[PDB]
Amino acid sequence: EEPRIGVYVCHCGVNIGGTVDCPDVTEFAKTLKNVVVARDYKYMCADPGQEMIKKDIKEHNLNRVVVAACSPRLHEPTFRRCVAEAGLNPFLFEFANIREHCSWVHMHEKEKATEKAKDLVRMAVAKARLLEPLEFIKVGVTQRALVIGGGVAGIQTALDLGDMGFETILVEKTPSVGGRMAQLDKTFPTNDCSICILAPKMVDVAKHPNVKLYAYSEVVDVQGYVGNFKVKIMKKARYIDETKCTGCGQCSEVCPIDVPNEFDMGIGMRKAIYKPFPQAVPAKYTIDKEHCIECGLCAKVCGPNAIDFDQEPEIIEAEVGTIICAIGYDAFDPTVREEYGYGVYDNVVTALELERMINASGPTGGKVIRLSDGQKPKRIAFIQCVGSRDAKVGNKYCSNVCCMYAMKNSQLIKEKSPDTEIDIYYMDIRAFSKGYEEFYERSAKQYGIKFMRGRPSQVIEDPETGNLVVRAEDTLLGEILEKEYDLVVLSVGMVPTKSADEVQKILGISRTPDQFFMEAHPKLRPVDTATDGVYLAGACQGPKDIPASVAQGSAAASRAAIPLAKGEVEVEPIIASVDAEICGGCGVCVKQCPYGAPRLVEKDGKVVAEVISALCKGCGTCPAGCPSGALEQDHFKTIQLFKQIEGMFRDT
Amino acid sequence: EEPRIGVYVCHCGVNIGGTVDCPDVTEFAKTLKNVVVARDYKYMCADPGQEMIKKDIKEHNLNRVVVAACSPRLHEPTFRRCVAEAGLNPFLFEFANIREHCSWVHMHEKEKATEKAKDLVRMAVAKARLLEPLEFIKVGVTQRALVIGGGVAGIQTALDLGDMGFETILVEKTPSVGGRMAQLDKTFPTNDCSICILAPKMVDVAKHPNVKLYAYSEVVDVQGYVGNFKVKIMKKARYIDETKCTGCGQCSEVCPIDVPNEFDMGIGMRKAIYKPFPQAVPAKYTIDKEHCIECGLCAKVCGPNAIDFDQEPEIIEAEVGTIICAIGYDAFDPTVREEYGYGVYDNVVTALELERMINASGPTGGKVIRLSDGQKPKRIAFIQCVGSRDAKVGNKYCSNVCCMYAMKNSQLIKEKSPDTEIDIYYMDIRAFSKGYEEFYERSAKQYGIKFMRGRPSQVIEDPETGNLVVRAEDTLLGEILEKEYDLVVLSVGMVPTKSADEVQKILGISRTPDQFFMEAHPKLRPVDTATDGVYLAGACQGPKDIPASVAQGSAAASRAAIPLAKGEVEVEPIIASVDAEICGGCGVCVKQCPYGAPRLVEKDGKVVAEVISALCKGCGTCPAGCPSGALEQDHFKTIQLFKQIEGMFRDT
Ligand SMILES: Cc1cc2nc3c(=O)[nH]c(=O)nc-3n(C[C@H](O)[C@H](O)[C@H](O)COP(=O)(O)OP(=O)(O)OC[C@H]3O[C@@H](n4cnc5c(N)ncnc54)[C@H](O)[C@@H]3O)c2cc1C
Ligand SMILES: Cc1cc2nc3c(=O)[nH]c(=O)nc-3n(C[C@H](O)[C@H](O)[C@H](O)COP(=O)(O)OP(=O)(O)OC[C@H]3O[C@@H](n4cnc5c(N)ncnc54)[C@H](O)[C@@H]3O)c2cc1C
Ligand code: SF4
Ligand code: SF4
Ligand code: SF4
Ligand code: SF4
Ligand code: SF4
Ligand code: SF4
Ligand code: SF4
Ligand code: SF4
Ligand code: SF4
Ligand code: SF4
Ligand code: SF4
Ligand code: SF4
Ligand SMILES: [Fe+3]
């Protein structure tokens, strides 16, 4: 049948129309072969736009639709549903990106943007002509979810999913769940005890009938696609019998190797054999082989003889339908900001270190003290925006929680020591949510915490006393201050967790300019990722506080429960297949597929290749590498791409 | 059975122990009748403390436990589970608040705080003896949800729930869904059209097989409890047949009466027969009988003969298991801040009015013009924090979105008119989320938008030109500015929607100090309300942007789907019941219950009262008002409270 194309040019208000002469693109579109209808409209995704496309498909008997608008990554599915509702196969629809790829990047070159939009429409029309109707692959959904990361976000997702009756697996890297919230002393704006409100949830998750918690474990491989993921979990060896482990802690005294306690941010000192924190769930010990010397002194003291160095990590194979990534974040390392002297001056600390110092169960026994002499500081300075809103360190974003935790900890220090003078050096106080501005008002009126508007230039240590001097301009007075302090606290920003690189490669997700994981759309889909069946929850998606993280955990559980509840999802048939009449079995394609989909086989007495459709993810590498042309990826066939290339220069 | 009590005194590190002599309280506790065990421990809510109680319950065959520590509002559930795990009924457990209520408020009066702690332990022990074992009530959950409010939040909740396969009802007050987002032109920080994200969602929700949309309707009554709500929806009369209506609008051209358009904030003029905005869903028309003259001119042009002036509102009865409140918000009315002259000066407008002015489909055709002469403003001033962070107007909170929308609309005005000079008068720029600080950086570096740190003192109009003068201190220079402008935009804050009062009374939910709806807990239950089966989503819970509102919509869908998925929920048994042998049917209790649980009935030839257990929420008002003592609230019986009162002065 002959192509009958409908070209729709969107103005997107003035986002496109303001730069691209949309009516002119529409007139040009009509001059192309097979383009029987062409219209321009203010909002193509809106109800009148979709109804326009639909009505035209029926009235003008179109078999190809071209939408010249935003990015397919945003609305390709929207328009596929719109055309499918009118009876047109969704793979006979072609998107032409003239907004993100044209109007938004060529704002001061309108005539050239208009010319570029015409070529992109022509390139789309060129591919559209040779597109073919494909059947969306209906696949089943394994009734099981996987949550990676055991913090407040991941815990919330697994609790909601388990409460809905869905089998859920929760994988936690460290020996205990709880995340950074377990390291905090109290939480703003209520000043609630962090662990005192988090432990009940850690307990609920550990004994939930629908949640399988795998602590001290890591996801090492994820294969498959939405509804059919095959996941490999490595249950790391603690080198201590899990069942015979009482969790008393008497084998650590003998250990001669001291390791800096990660939980205490490097202030505290733990042993090779240890426990992360007192309220840890599950309550069990672990041997760190990265620092263990295998002297066996701990084994001589250990009664049960739970210690076993011949313990081997177990690889667990599990099948899940959806995956929620909630690996959280790490605190920025301020050593780079050399003028603040972190790592040089003893009394300059990060706010996360301060949290561990304030926390009752911390290394200093809940006592805020100077690391140089052990004395309690009488004067303290908080420096805001450390590692945030700073191009020199590559973090041009706001870490969201630093203004609030700085004011919070200042209140906690005042409650414990009212005579302590506290000054906060800031640019903007961001107390933007419920009770936050009130919390800010309170810090000053009730606790007498002082605020200086001015980002400090440098910190200088007095080598005689260990005291620090903060150099900064009081911008509200137009004068330079040089105030002395007993302790300087750096309000460090949030950065992606160290393992984020590994987790990205395993799930196949992307990152935003801030290096955190990328959501499908900031407003249309805040917890979904462009990768179907993979969602996000918490700080790994971007800097945010506890409630925002808990809300995302719940949101991710809802989004992740949709495929599980439906029990069936539709996946793209943009897969590779071998033309047996052309394949002479050269074997080049076999090793190119990382999923082993193409395989050599005997057919009609000779050897040919055959793609196992289910294992093909649709990359297009093997057809590109096929020297006979027998292999072709549906929707990205060489001929289709060839016509698309011709389209940039001429009509074909 | 004789009470066997176990009293546990917590030190909470030194939070209690540092003020209250805990070992002394423990000694005193042992002198009370029925106390078999009494122990003091550093952290009772920790694993060792919980195991200590569980072990003692079994080893000393205890039937009552008293924990003298923090507030039951924090750990009552924790200790309930702890004792229930040891076999002790959770209602035989009694909390004594000696931290929030004693050690934390009597820090400088240790002796008296110790004496007070002893009395509180004695008061608890006194009630404990007469406590009884109670069993939770199991009720079924109607597999249906109700979403009130058709904004982006409510739409998101309805879509997720419907996508999960749950029958959902979406009630929208105005003739179209979309909310305030529908009124915006673009949305920060992506500068997408509001329609980009919202319209496809409006489209989907209107044709969702599991969602019943009731536009131009209001919930007028809600009765029952979680899983068993009986709701009444009033389908208001549009005076047009929706099934017959095409939504062409030939009628709008013929109608001779002009009504101010609410959607355009009074800056637009609509007709008696109308469609809120061009992209409205349902794409149907409505007749405002408040202004219609009944000339019947619109009926002459309507082909399908849809106009019916004899239309009567229909009351729909529906049964739902859960309810999600997403009624949104209203823009603050700045008339009160008389110094800014809103409602006096023609060229002083609110940012929401500006949104309608700058929207292509708005009254001015997307042209920002002065309302005094129709001329385009060459100089514009944005005043931040209007109606927020201000005690004089009673709004001491941050409205969250004003810094961002002010910078967004300034970018939009510059794209349309680069020669326009824009100055933003602010205190703090709150660009706190992903891409926000970047958006802020961009407004200044790319668009040349200027920022003045100074909350303006007043605006003064030139009566001859209509131009405004902004009086403010440039705090970063310590000088007073008196700059002239062609248009002043007031960045109005968010306040609860007008109907919030009516909805609050229907659902039985509370409000936080900012007048927005109150969440169960800020940190851990951000979308649940203290009223079981009633959840929140969006701006009605507090000022927030679209990304957060969509996330809450999804979060609410997850939380609201838990009871629906379980199909069974439990209810606290701290309810009222009548002792038939004592009740002589005096009828005093009946009218005291706002839920109508106590009812008069005939039993064995005589009249007696009978509480319908499921309708009792457990307030204790009718038993308190019962003159025969036949009515009692389990867990708060008069005798139980009497002993508690005696306990303050002596041992019972
Ligand atoms: C100094 C400071 C003070 C703060 N104060 C407050 C406050 O007072 N109130 C407030 O609301 N918020 C506060 N915040 C923000 C708060 O810490 C976060 O909102 C919270 O930690 C986010 O929880 P999360 O689960 O998203 O991430 P996380 O808490 O970091 O949890 C992530 C979890 O996943 C695990 N994990 C990491 N990588 C992997 C992997 N590859 N595989 C498996 N598991 C993995 C981690 O070990 C961790 O347990 C503060 C932040 C800082 C830095
Ligand atoms: C001037 C301005 C500019 C803004 N710009 C941005 C921006 O650029 N980006 C951004 O992210 N955010 C922005 N915001 C914030 C944004 O408007 C909100 O986040 C968003 O509208 C939240 O939608 P909602 O569903 O929570 O409430 P709403 O949008 O207010 O929707 C509430 C819905 O419920 C309905 N309703 C009300 N009462 C009842 C009842 N009794 N029964 C039934 N239905 C009822 C209403 O008719 C309405 O449809 C801006 C706000 C303002 C004021
Ligand atoms: S290894 Fe043995 S001594 Fe060490 S905590 Fe476990 S049970 Fe106790
Ligand atoms: S064998 Fe390893 S864990 Fe045990 S005492 Fe020696 S160094 Fe410590
Ligand atoms: S939340 Fe506050 S301290 Fe933190 S990056 Fe933003 S402005 Fe800076
Ligand atoms: S690369 Fe092509 S010709 Fe070679 S075996 Fe594979 S499909 Fe056949
Ligand atoms: S196109 Fe080829 S290389 Fe790519 S996933 Fe498919 S079978 Fe593998
Ligand atoms: S039981 Fe209450 S008072 Fe005691 S340690 Fe726990 S939170 Fe603190
Ligand atoms: S989202 Fe895409 S189709 Fe919709 S108005 Fe914007 S550019 Fe147009
Ligand atoms: S003329 Fe009739 S069909 Fe057309 S929009 Fe008006 S009421 Fe609806
Ligand atoms: S009958 Fe009513 S709706 Fe129709 S034209 Fe007259 S005033 Fe307008
Ligand atoms: S978001 Fe900005 S303009 Fe709005 S109340 Fe807060 S500080 Fe003021
Ligand atoms: S108030 Fe008491 S005595 Fe009177 S009818 Fe009710 S239960 Fe009976
Ligand atoms: S105790 Fe309260 S809720 Fe219960 S039946 Fe009596 S008045 Fe109603
Ligand atoms: Fe506690």
Please check whether residue B313 touches A, CB under 8 A.
Answer: no
How far apart, in whole angstroms, are the C-alpha atoms of residue B396 and residue B391? 5
Strands (E), A1-114: 5-10, 35-41, 64-69, 93-97
Name the minimum distance, in Å, from the CA of A420 to any CA of chain B. 18
Find out whether B403 and B384 touch, Cβ atoms under 8 Å: yes
- The rounded Cα B647 to chain-centroid distance in angstroms is 39
Both tokens of B258, joined, read: 């002009």
- Token look-up 């949305």 returns B187
How far apart, in whole angstroms, are the C-alpha atoms of residue A461 and residue B472? 40
Please check whether residue B457 touches A, CB under 8 A.
Answer: no
In CATH, the architecture of B576-641 is: 2-Layer Sandwich (3.30)
Q: Looking at ligand 1, which atom is closest to the CA of residue A331?
A: 53
- In B, minimum Cα distance to A361 occurs at B13
Burial of A12 (0-12, 13-18, 19+ CB in 10 A): buried
Strands (E), A336-485: 348-350, 379-386, 421-426, 450-453, 458-461, 468-474, 479-485
- Which helix or strand (DSSP H or E) is residue A214 part of? strand A211-214
Contact state of A526 with B551 under an 8 Å Cβ cutoff: yes
Find out whether A96 and A4 touch, Cβ atoms under 8 Å: no
Contact state of A398 with B524 under an 8 Å Cβ cutoff: no
B384 phi and psi angles, rounded to 5 deg: -85, 165
Chosen from A103, A437, A521 to mutate, greatest number of chain B CBs within 10 A: A437
Q: How was this structure obtained?
A: X-ray
Burial of A299 (0-12, 13-18, 19+ CB in 10 A): middle
Q: Looking at ligand 2, which atom is closest to the CA of residue A523?
A: 11
Give residues 564 to 623 of A whose Cβ lies within 8 Å of B: 565-566
How much distance in Å is there from the Cα of A588 to the middle of ligand 6? 6
Residues of chain B contacting residue A431, judged by C-beta atoms under 8 Å apart: 398
- In A, minimum Cα distance to B205 occurs at A47
Name the minimum distance, in Å, from the CA of B164 to any CA of chain A. 5
Largest CA distance in chain A: 92
Strands (E), A493-597: 494-496, 534-536, 568-571, 576-578
User: Which residues make Cβ contacts (< 8 Å) with residue A320, sequence separation at least 6?
Assistant: A142, A144, A145, A146, A169, A229, A231
Please check whether residue B73 touches A, CB under 8 A.
Answer: no
Both tokens of B379, joined, read: 């100089």
Q: How far is CA B279 from CA A50, A363, B489, in A?
A: 11, 61, 27
Helix axes B436-445, B402-416, angle to 10 degrees: 40
Asked whether B544 lines ligand 12 (CB < 6 A), one says no
How far apart, in whole angstroms, are the C-alpha atoms of residue B652 and residue B644? 9
Contact state of B523 with A546 under an 8 Å Cβ cutoff: yes
Find out whether A88 and A57 touch, Cβ atoms under 8 Å: yes
How far apart, in whole angstroms, are the C-alpha atoms of residue B251 and residue B298? 4
Contact state of B432 with A278 under an 8 Å Cβ cutoff: no
Chosen from A510, A554, A564, A566 to mutate, greatest number of chain B CBs within 10 A: A554
Closest Cα to atom 3 of ligand 13? B583
Q: Where are the alpha helices (DSSP H) in A328-395?
A: 351-358
Both tokens of A520, joined, read: 């499908």
How far apart, in whole angstroms, are the C-alpha atoms of residue B136 and residue A180? 35
How far apart, in whole angstroms, are the C-alpha atoms of residue B154 and residue A98? 32
Asked whether B44 lines ligand 14 (CB < 6 A), one says no
Final resolution, Å? 2.2
Q: How far is CA A343 from CA A333, A378, A383, A386, B400, in A?
A: 10, 22, 16, 14, 37
A409 phi and psi angles, rounded to 5 deg: -60, -30
Find out whether A380 and A423 touch, Cβ atoms under 8 Å: yes
Q: How far is CA B434 from CA A72, A535, B481, in A?
A: 22, 17, 33
- The rounded Cα A263 to chain-centroid distance in angstroms is 22
Q: Where are the alpha helices (DSSP H) in B131-218?
A: 152-163, 179-183, 194-206
Contact state of B522 with A196 under an 8 Å Cβ cutoff: no
Name the minimum distance, in Å, from the CA of B579 to any CA of chain A. 37
Residues of chain A contacting residue B186, judged by C-beta atoms under 8 Å apart: 13, 15
How far apart, in whole angstroms, are the C-alpha atoms of residue B38 and residue B61? 14
Contact state of B46 with A389 under an 8 Å Cβ cutoff: no
Per-residue b/e over B259-270, b at no fewer than 16 CB within 10 Å?
bebebbbebbeb
Contact state of B544 with A433 under an 8 Å Cβ cutoff: yes
Contact state of B428 with A429 under an 8 Å Cβ cutoff: yes
The 3-state DSSP class for residue A489 equals: strand
Name the minimum distance, in Å, from the CA of A403 to any CA of chain B. 10
Residues of chain A contacting residue B537, judged by C-beta atoms under 8 Å apart: none
How much distance in Å is there from the Cα of A634 to the middle of ligand 9? 27
How far apart, in whole angstroms, are the C-alpha atoms of residue B526 and residue B548? 12
- Token look-up 């003078």 returns A421
User: Which residues make Cβ contacts (< 8 Å) with residue B545, sequence separation at least 6?
Assistant: B188, B400, B401, B404, B433
Both tokens of A337, joined, read: 């900001």
B469 phi and psi angles, rounded to 5 deg: -120, 130
Listing DSSP states for B77-135 in one string gives HHHHHHHHHTT--GGGEEEEE-IIIIITT-TT-HHHHHHHHHHHHHHHHHHHHT-----
